[PDB]
Design a protein around this ligand. Structure first.
Ligand code: B12
Ligand SMILES: *[C@@H]1O[C@H](CO)[C@@H](O[C@@H]2O[C@H](CO)[C@@H](O[C@@H]3O[C@H](CO[C@H]4O[C@H](CO)[C@@H](O)[C@H](O)[C@@H]4O)[C@@H](O)[C@H](O[C@H]4O[C@H](CO)[C@@H](O)[C@H](O)[C@@H]4O)[C@@H]3O)[C@H](O)[C@H]2NC(C)=O)[C@H](O)[C@H]1NC(C)=O
Ligand SMILES: *[C@@H]1O[C@H](CO)[C@@H](O[C@@H]2O[C@H](CO)[C@@H](O[C@@H]3O[C@H](CO[C@H]4O[C@H](CO)[C@@H](O)[C@H](O)[C@@H]4O)[C@@H](O)[C@H](O[C@H]4O[C@H](CO)[C@@H](O)[C@H](O)[C@@H]4O)[C@@H]3O)[C@H](O)[C@H]2NC(C)=O)[C@H](O)[C@H]1NC(C)=O
Ligand SMILES: *[C@@H]1O[C@H](CO)[C@@H](O[C@@H]2O[C@H](CO)[C@@H](O)[C@H](O)[C@H]2NC(C)=O)[C@H](O)[C@H]1NC(C)=O
Ligand SMILES: *C1O[C@H](CO)[C@@H](O)[C@H](O)[C@H]1NC(C)=O
Ligand SMILES: *[C@@H]1O[C@H](CO)[C@@H](O)[C@H](O)[C@H]1NC(C)=O
Ligand SMILES: *[C@@H]1O[C@H](CO)[C@@H](O)[C@H](O)[C@H]1NC(C)=O
Ligand SMILES: *[C@@H]1O[C@H](CO)[C@@H](O)[C@H](O)[C@H]1NC(C)=O
Ligand SMILES: *[C@@H]1O[C@H](CO)[C@@H](O)[C@H](O)[C@H]1NC(C)=O
Ligand SMILES: *[C@@H]1O[C@H](CO)[C@@H](O)[C@H](O)[C@H]1NC(C)=O
Ligand SMILES: *[C@H]1O[C@H](CO)[C@@H](O)[C@H](O)[C@H]1NC(C)=O
Ligand SMILES: [Ca+2]
Ligand SMILES: [Ca+2]
Ligand SMILES: [Ca+2]
Ligand SMILES: [Ca+2]
Lengths: 457, 385
């Protein structure tokens, strides 16, 4: 098969697609679009048999208008977007006998090279700035900034100038999208608008991906910021009650011989839980080449919940405590695509088994509390001790005999009370070693904050 | 164009009166009507003079943004000076902002009235708001509601025609962009049978389409729609005077846009005088799964004399038989809204109402108009928009 394309827009079908492609192919495509223009490739879908040297099945794309080629691609990995130097592109697909899959869908479109701002950076030097800066940036402009660096380090971006159009309500006019990887769908560090200087941004990788969009009207000076490529560190302290993170280069295969680290801790007294939209690493009996260790607790010293490797997708991993540590290490040679990890923080049926003291805060806190919760914490006092209370913040919905939203307290089996309002409840003490806290919340709110409280033994 | 066949005109002056008759001293004063009868030329000068005086005396603080726009506009068509209401709305609209792009589409129906009425007093002074509004409306991404699409196009058409001489090439281009995008969304809802969106939304939409600067790709079959609406009046679908008020203008070949051109004292014509059942059972569920931790799924069955009993009788009779089906009601320009069932009340800050559906698909008449069939299952879900 194979075809050549003139259209400004089009799609590109793997022969087998929607399922699956034939073994042993030699097919080729050629995409040509008007001059002074560029080809932008999207990538709806893409399965292929995987291969470290990338030999068996694979897809490569030469930059026709130029020497060199954009690369060869097997597996699941392939940047959601690619963009040519010229107005012409080679597109060869080539396979082998054993092993096939749903193939790939893949869109593309023409793009003027004037209106086309996209710029890559490496030098460990912040020369980077909104279009036209300090003059006013243009309208209907879009503009992208990838910045990659040395494989050890992290990126840390500071802002010098930043004045962008204000936000209508929770609607953005004009913004600066910052992502944690090197691709348009990597975790979201933040979107930034208006007139305040963004905080210092810090990565968890050596790649950063940025986009500045502007709408039909209204213009300002824009921004200017710089960056440090120093630490050789990678991973980070992950502070939100829920979030998402990335094995370097993802969805591209990761770096080798690196040991990345991530510590989940946010809301006091509520356990985290993991999950993966995608796992792949070196398969290994007994596991140990390149692996991913989770740890019930703040450091490696804590009880190791699991070590993972290979190609299979894990069962969610409920930490049993406040913190959760995660370390991953790779040996030189061999690299899988990597992982992507949704992680939520739970509160159903947790137990503090042993702790001298601590804090209990409703997950978001001080963010207003999630609708529809059946929350059940239980602090246990060793031996024949007890637990003193004291509250620090309280702000629930109101009355109806505390039948709308509420919070209960328990001394073992006995109830000590049911609370709500913005009234702070009394200190107290269990005559038991068991101490249960129940917070039941319904489906609406003015967005009352939650609660916070202390504990003893 | 699709001006009403003179043959069919009697059919029109019909409802015109049937609407004007709804105006009494205890009726809820309905601006939409006074605009409608001013636009169409009022028969009942006693009625018109009555309902004007009511709107004049209205208290500014009981008026939401939409109310207020409607009112300014309604007064304007009676050649009465709103003056003060305009100041107020103007101040209220500087400070105006929507919620979020995932927020509901009708959230823009209210502001569409404000802008429209405001643009009509002062276009140049309205520009900022009109821009803020368009940018946002466009960006919003909830499921298109036609009623709102239609009103937005009036507000937005008016502004589009009043770009101050000199203004950066940009306003018009933004307004028009949104205007086209909206008109596409609308033609896309014209049924293979003349209706745009649905019946009660059709009148608004007719206005919209016959006024936007850029027509839809697929050309709109006006004559079809205007004929469809006409047979549909023979069929008694337009008894509720508010709904009359929302098609009367199109039928009289007008839009809220012509309000500033209303003339006063034409001296209108007298529209000449034109002169068993076994009670049924309906299954009535009332379900709360949203408010507090005290909620309901309680179903029930009742008898309602003949058909021709409207859903409200079912409600009242359920209320009477069983105290759990108590409900409380509240009056509006469209009529009686069920505001609370079982002490669970709609609340604005929760964006939370009582929705009535037939088994599973939502109703589209108020309980005081809707007529249930011999073994129908009506459920009332407390839910949100
Ligand atoms: C947004 C909206 C609602 C919202 C209103 C949000 C709010 N609280 O402001 C809620 C409240 C979500 C709503 C409810 C219903 N409404 Co509605 N509503 C609309 C819409 C699109 C906007 C009207 C508006 O904002 N007015 C702007 C201001 C300036 O005027 P207003 O006097 O303050 O308007 C008030 C009334 O319109 C009232 N309202 C809104 N919908 C309905 C429906 C009925 C039957 C009544 C009596 C009142 C009412 O709420 C507004 C604030 O009080 C219109 C479309 C239209 N063309 O009118 C319909 C519309 C009038 N409502 C309609 C319907 C069918 C319903 C529902 C019956 C649907 C259902 N399955 O329950 C329910 C009624 C349930 C009940 N318990 O009574 C239909 C007409 C009904 C009819 N008898 O012909 C309309 C025409 C939409 C349509 N084209 O079908 N909807
Ligand atoms: C990008 O971001 C930075 C801010 O983070 C901004 O850069 C500053 O711009 C301001 C004003 O435009 C500068 O302040 C000015 O300093 C003048 C002196 O020049 C030199 O001497 C001083 C002191 O030793 C240095 O700090 C300075 O950097 C120079 O080397 C003063 O004469 C002025 O202060 C006067 O201004 C106001 C009224 O307007 C008075 O009330 C003051 O008290 C005083 O009389 C002048 O304000 C500042 O020097 C710049 N900072 C930098 C770059 O270090 C940019 O504005 C911003 N935008 C762009 C496009 O670059
Ligand atoms: C009577 O009244 C009740 C209350 O009004 C209704 O209850 C809700 O119904 C909706 C479904 O229509 C539910 O909301 C949706 O949930 C979907 C899937 O579940 C979510 O929850 C889990 C975890 O708890 C998530 O992990 C998951 O990914 C979901 O987010 C979502 O797909 C929906 O998202 C979409 O809808 C919204 C608008 O509502 C969009 O704007 C989004 O962008 C998106 O496309 C949504 O979140 C809700 O869970 C129900 N809960 C309850 C108990 O109220 C009844 O449906 C109603 N019955 C009838 C027929 O009247
Ligand atoms: C809080 O959740 C826990 C479960 O994590 C409940 O604790 C007890 O659980 C045992 C089995 O684990 C049950 O037999 C009992 O019903 C529970 N004991 C007591 C004294 O109640 C506990 O019930 C929960 N509190 C709630 C949901 O009311
Ligand atoms: C229908 O019949 C019931 C008894 O079957 C009667 O009580 C009721 O009056 C009728 N419906 C109404 C209230 O008009
Ligand atoms: C993969 O094998 C090696 C990589 O070191 C390279 O020389 C070779 O050309 C690659 N595949 C091909 C095209 O044979
Ligand atoms: C995260 O927290 C630890 C413990 O305080 C600290 O030592 C480390 O420097 C932090 N890591 C980062 C991302 O800076
Ligand atoms: C808590 O103490 C240690 C952890 O330091 C743990 O091993 C022990 O089992 C716990 N104690 C109780 C009372 O369960
Ligand atoms: C716990 O609090 C009570 C308050 O009545 C007090 O009597 C007791 O001494 C406290 N115990 C501790 C842990 O100090
Ligand atoms: C609490 O529930 C509601 C509050 O309105 C009330 O009807 C009920 O009787 C109350 N119960 C008590 C306090 O006995
Ligand atoms: C892991 O090492 C090998 C896996 O092939 C196995 O024989 C051994 O028993 C396992 N346990 C040890 C010794 O770590
Ligand atoms: Ca193969
Ligand atoms: Ca802008
Ligand atoms: Ca390796
Ligand atoms: Ca709540």
């Amino acid at each position: 098969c194979g075809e050549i394309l003139t259209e400004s827009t089009g799609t590109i079908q793997s022969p087998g697609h929607p399922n699956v492609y034939p073994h042993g192919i030699n097919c080729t495509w050629h995409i040509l679009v008007q001059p002074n223009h560029l080809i932008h490739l999207m990538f709806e879908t893409f399965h292929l048999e995987f291969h470290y040297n990338c030999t068996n099945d694979y897809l490569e794309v030469y930059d026709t208008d130029s020497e060199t080629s954009l690369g060869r691609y097997c597996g699941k990995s392939i940047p959601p977007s690619l963009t040519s130097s010229g107005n012409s592109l080679m597109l060869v697909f080539v396979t082998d006998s054993d092993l096939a899959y749903e193939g790939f869908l893949i869109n593309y479109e023409a793009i003027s090279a004037a209106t086309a701002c996209l710029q890559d950076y490496t030098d460990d030097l912040g020369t980077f700035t909104s279009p036209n800066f300090p003059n006013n940036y243009p309208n209907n402009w879009e503009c992208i900034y990838r910045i990659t660096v040395r494989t050890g380090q992290l990126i840390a971006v500071h802002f010098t100038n930043f004045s962008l159009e204000e936000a209508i309500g929770n609607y953005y006019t004009d913004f600066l999208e910052i992502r944690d990887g090197g691709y348009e769908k990597s975790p979201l560090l933040g979107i930034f608008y208006g007139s305040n200087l963004p905080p210092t941004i810090i990565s968890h990788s050596n790649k950063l991906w940025l986009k500045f969009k502007s709408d039909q009207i209204d213009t300002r000076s824009g921004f200017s910021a710089y960056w440090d490529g120093s630490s050789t560190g990678c991973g980070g302290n992950l502070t939100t009650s829920s979030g998402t993170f990335i094995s370097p280069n993802y969805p591209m295969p990761y770096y080798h011989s690196s040991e990345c680290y991530w510590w989940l801790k946010s809301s006091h007294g509520s356990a985290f839980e993991l999950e993966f939209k995608d796992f792949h690493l070196e398969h290994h009996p007994n596991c140990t080449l390149d692996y991913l260790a989770v740890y019930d607790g703040p450091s490696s010293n804590s009880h190791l919940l699991t070590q993972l490797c290979g190609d299979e997708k894990p069962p969610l991993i409920r930490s049993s405590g406040d913190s959760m540590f995660i370390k991953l290490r790779t040996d030189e040679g061999q690299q899988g695509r990597g992982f992507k990890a949704e992680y939520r923080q739970t509160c159903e049926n947790v137990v503090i088994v042993n702790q001298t003291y601590g804090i209990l805060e409703s997950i978001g806190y001080p963010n207003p509390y999630s609708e529809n919760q059946h929350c059940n914490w239980t602090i246990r006092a060793t031996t024949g001790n007890t637990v003193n209370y004291t509250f620090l913040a309280f702000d629930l919905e109101h009355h109806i005999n505390c039948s709308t939203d509420y919070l209960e307290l328990y001394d073992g089996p006995r109830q000590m009370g049911r609370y709500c309002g913005v009234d702070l409840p009394p200190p107290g003490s269990t005559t038991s070693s068991k101490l249960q806290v129940l917070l039941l919340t319904d489906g609406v709110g003015r967005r009352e904050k939650g609660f916070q409280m202390q504990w003893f033994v | 164009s699709c001006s009403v066949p003179s043959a069919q005109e009697p059919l029109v002056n019909g409802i015109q009166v049937l609407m004007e008759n709804s105006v009494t001293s205890s009726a809820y004063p309905n601006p939409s009507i006074l605009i409608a009868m001013n636009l169409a030329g009022a028969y009942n000068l006693k009625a018109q003079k009555l309902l004007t005086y009511q709107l004049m005396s209205s208290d500014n603080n009981d008026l939401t943004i939409g109310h207020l726009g409607l009112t300014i506009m309604a007064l304007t068509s009676s050649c009465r000076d709103p003056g003060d209401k305009v100041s107020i709305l103007q101040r209220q609209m500087e400070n105006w902002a929507p919620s979020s792009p995932n927020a509901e589409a009708s959230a823009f129906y209210g502001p569409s009235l404000a802008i429209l009425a405001l643009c009509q007093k002062n276009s140049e002074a309205t520009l900022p708001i009109a821009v803020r509004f368009a940018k946002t409306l466009l960006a919003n991404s909830s499921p298109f509601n036609v009623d709102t699409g239609a009103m937005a196009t009036l507000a937005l058409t008016c502004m589009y025609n009043k770009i101050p001489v000199g203004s950066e090439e940009g306003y018009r281009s933004l307004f028009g962009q949104v205007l086209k995008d909206i008109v596409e969304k609308i033609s896309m809802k014209i049924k293979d049978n003349g209706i745009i969106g649905d019946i009660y939304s059709t009148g608004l939409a007719m206005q919209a389409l016959s006024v936007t600067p850029e027509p839809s790709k697929k050309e709109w079959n006006c004559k079809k729609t205007t004929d469809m609406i006409l047979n549909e009046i023979k069929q008694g679908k337009f008894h509720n005077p508010m709904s009359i008020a929302q098609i009367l203008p199109s039928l009289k070949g007008k839009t809220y846009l012509d309000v500033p051109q209303v003339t006063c004292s034409p001296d209108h014509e007298v529209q000449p005088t034109l002169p068993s059942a076994s009670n049924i059972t309906v299954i009535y569920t009332i379900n709360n799964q949203l408010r507090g931790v005290e909620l309901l799924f309680n179903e029930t069955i009742n008898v309602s004399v003949k058909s021709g009993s409207v859903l409200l009788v079912v409600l009242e009779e359920a209320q009477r038989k069983n105290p759990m089906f108590k409900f409380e009601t509240t009056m509006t320009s469209w009529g009686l809204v069920v505001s609370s069932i079982n002490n669970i009340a709609e609340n604005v800050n929760h964006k939370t109402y009582w929705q009535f559906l037939s088994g599973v698909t939502p109703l589209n008449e108020g309980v005081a108009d809707y007529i249930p069939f011999n073994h129908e299952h009506i459920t009332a879900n407390f839910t949100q928009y």
